[PDB]
Design a protein around this ligand. Structure first.
Ligand SMILES: [Ca+2]
Ligand SMILES: [Ca+2]
Ligand SMILES: [Ca+2]
Ligand SMILES: [Ca+2]
Ligand SMILES: [Ca+2]
Ligand SMILES: [Ca+2]
Ligand SMILES: [Pt+2]
Ligand SMILES: [Pt+2]
Lengths: 436, 434
């Protein structure tokens, strides 16, 4: 899709909803879920706290604090994955992922907790999958349980080939050899959607990649922070692209989502793959022109030159630009989540078969319509709730007339006029929007 | 997708198959089908003939010649749609579409015939839907019967807003009012995929457009000459774009495929909608730079400026280029059909879940892989069988190791070196690749 202008973003104020800020100054609130108990449950990435919030009173209780979560003030690590077992009434399990120290500096661990209704706390931790890659960037860590009773987990490309990890070789395209799998060496588990058995084991029906079946379900992802099943069992996803080409994807078993060889469509438009890990020396600078213009000494591959297998293009890019685009703000929105709106007895008019995708950099929540079979998007990503806030997550109440959203505590956002501000209107908040 | 180069096309000689010409004296052979009798049945667009060829021996018989088919030597009109009833043994019907004079100068008629096995001919013609638009351009006319036992018919945009019909307002986005529909006025049936009951009536569960349920199933199409169901009931489609953006589409009930406001993706890239029907000066020229560069006096709308409803982007474009592209060849392939490769006991290795798309301009058959659920394409459109031929249609034998292709009688095609030739290697032929 083509980028909206500052003016188009500015006017998306959603005067059809009442806004009520339930909480503010949470410490990097990250994921929120409608709890089995009909309360809002939300995580603090930095602290590892699992908070339960009564939306009417805003009364908060720290249900549990995941011990030894490791978080860097300047990083995106910490407590990430958060889900309840689908049949919680009979399987009182909470699944999380987080950054922890790796004795063998960190690792990511997917762990199950048992919720004790009696003592209102979490206990009996079980590590389902450990030794996963960890870094300060592009951790992703969206964890959901599919209709197939499997854990689907997004694990970002760790920031390789940008900024602090510029010269490290991106592994989004790499997959484990059997020997690595045997040694539980999960270094290739970067830029992937993993599909695991509930016990953490490899599903025998996982796709095969380069002759090996591993936890990998799809590969070629950059920073997939959004993952949501549709009512008909499809898996939708949102992912942050580089200077361009944030994506809405349909996750298909064994698909290759192209990163880093391809950003968005395979169109050679506005992006090229500049591999700094293969650059002539580490003193070379990243011009930050999305590979369209690069400093001498870094090998560049057009998207069309990639010898790819099972490349799956995005359903929608936010956004795609041409090579002439001036990167020197970028034509992206930094989607932070992806939520399948299920409607309900007070379903919002026209919102059938929509995907809600919060934007960090634009301070909007996009509404993306799909056909009733969730096979295609219809039209464009429609901005809502414009404000000087970094929207981090969104859910709806079971009745469907109320949206609960999280905002970041700190960071930059585009103001109505297009300029950047780091003055966020509702820092680290839990906000409810009620359809009028 | 990004255009392949002439050398990339030139090398696509599919050397792993043996080519054999089965028939070489066809006149504008258009559609071919693997028939219920395990014979190949094929149409001749201008003559209206329906031929049946023994796939093994190559013997052929003219089963029928559809009377009064109208065709212009400079046009794409004539005998178009061709399909068998899916349960032919018990329902010996053949459905066609064709250009006929309109006594109310032409119309398109979707017509059923009954096959008589004993005299081996067609009889008892029944007009299922008449008064459909007709013109010399962008007729499309692929007719298939879906798993739902409904006829699906592609009817092109009639060439409006280009060449001889430059100044006629494209109706791809337009839909009938209930009055028009009640009066059997199908002028808006241009640039659509229609879905009709077997008797020609409107399916009660057809989608609604602008508040009306008509035979329209999808709208916003230019020249959709490819239509094929997948084994799991999805409807794949190919469509010719203008100077760019030929498409592979997944046809979804009630979808709007954007033409003419949007070519390919809604990307404002390499195309813009220059509406000549809205140019107050009818002497205005079409610079033919795909709307990117236009003469003064024609309103141009960017793809992103269109107020579209239910816009469905293509699965794949052949091809998409940037605004800097120089249209003075074009980044298209002119897909002439779309065939779902079903494999079989001698299936071609690696061709699972592929869609075969013959190219007129490039003289190749593209193979487009999809995932096993036919939800997404995998990788790119891979060219095969490069030749100086305009490939018109393609099917495979039941076992999967033989491909049967029709080639145009005449026209232009790109040679291995990128230059154009109107010297076709196999004019109006039925060829097989084993
Ligand atoms: Ca980005
Ligand atoms: Ca991608
Ligand atoms: Ca791209
Ligand atoms: Ca064309
Ligand atoms: Ca289209
Ligand atoms: Ca376009
Ligand atoms: Pt809205
Ligand atoms: Pt080949």
């Amino acid at each position: 899709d083509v980028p909206l202008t500052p003016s188009q973003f500015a006017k998306a104020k959603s005067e059809n909803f009442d806004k009520k800020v339930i909480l503010s100054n949470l410490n990097k609130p990250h994921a929120l879920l409608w709890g089995p108990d009909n309360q809002i449950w939300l995580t603090e990435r930095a602290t590892g706290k699992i908070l339960r919030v009564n939306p009417e009173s805003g009364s908060v209780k720290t249900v549990f604090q995941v011990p030894e979560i490791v978080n860097d003030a300047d990083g995106q690590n910490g407590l990430l994955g958060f889900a309840f077992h689908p049949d919680f009434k009979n399987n009182p399990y909470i699944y999380i992922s987080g950054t922890f120290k790796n004795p063998k500096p960190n690792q990511t661990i997917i762990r199950r907790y048992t919720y004790n209704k009696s003592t209102d706390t979490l206990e009996k931790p079980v590590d389902l999958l450990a030794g996963l890659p960890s870094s300060k960037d592009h951790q992703s860590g969206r964890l959901v349980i599919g209709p197939d009773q499997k854990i689907y987990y997004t694990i970002g490309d760790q920031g390789r080939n940008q900024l602090a990890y510029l010269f490290l070789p991106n592994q989004a395209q790499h997959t484990p050899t059997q020997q690595e799998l045997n040694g539980k060496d999960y270094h290739t588990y970067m830029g992937k959607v993993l599909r695991l058995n509930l016990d953490g084991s490899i599903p025998k029906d996982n796709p095969s990649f380069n002759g090996v079946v591993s936890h990998i379900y799809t590969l070629g992802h950059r920073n997939p922070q959004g993952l949501a099943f549709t009512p008909n069992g499809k898996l939708l996803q949102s992912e942050q692209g580089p200077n361009s080409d944030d994506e809405i994807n349909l996750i298909v078993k064994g698909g290759n989502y192209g990163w880093p060889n391809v950003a968005g469509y395979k169109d050679d438009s506005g992006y090229a793959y500049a591999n700094y890990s293969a650059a002539a020396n580490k003193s070379i600078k990243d011009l930050a022109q999305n590979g369209v213009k690069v400093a001498a000494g870094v090998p560049v591959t057009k998207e069309s030159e990639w010898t790819g297998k099972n490349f799956v293009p995005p359903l929608k890019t936010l956004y795609t630009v041409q090579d002439t685009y001036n990167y020197n703000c970028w034509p992206t929105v930094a989607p932070s989540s992806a939520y399948v709106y299920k409607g309900g007895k007070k379903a919002i008019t026209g919102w059938e078969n929509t995907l809600l995708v919060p934007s960090l950099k634009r301070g909007v929540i996009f509404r993306i319509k799909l056909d009733p079979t969730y096979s295609t998007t219809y039209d464009d990503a429609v901005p809502m709730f414009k404000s000087n806030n970094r929207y981090r997550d969104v859910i709806a109440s079971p009745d469907g007339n109320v949206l609960y959203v999280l905002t970041d505590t700190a960071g930059n956002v585009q103001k109505d006029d297009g300029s950047v501000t780091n003055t966020l209107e509702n820092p680290g908040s839990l906000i409810k929007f009620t359809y009028k």
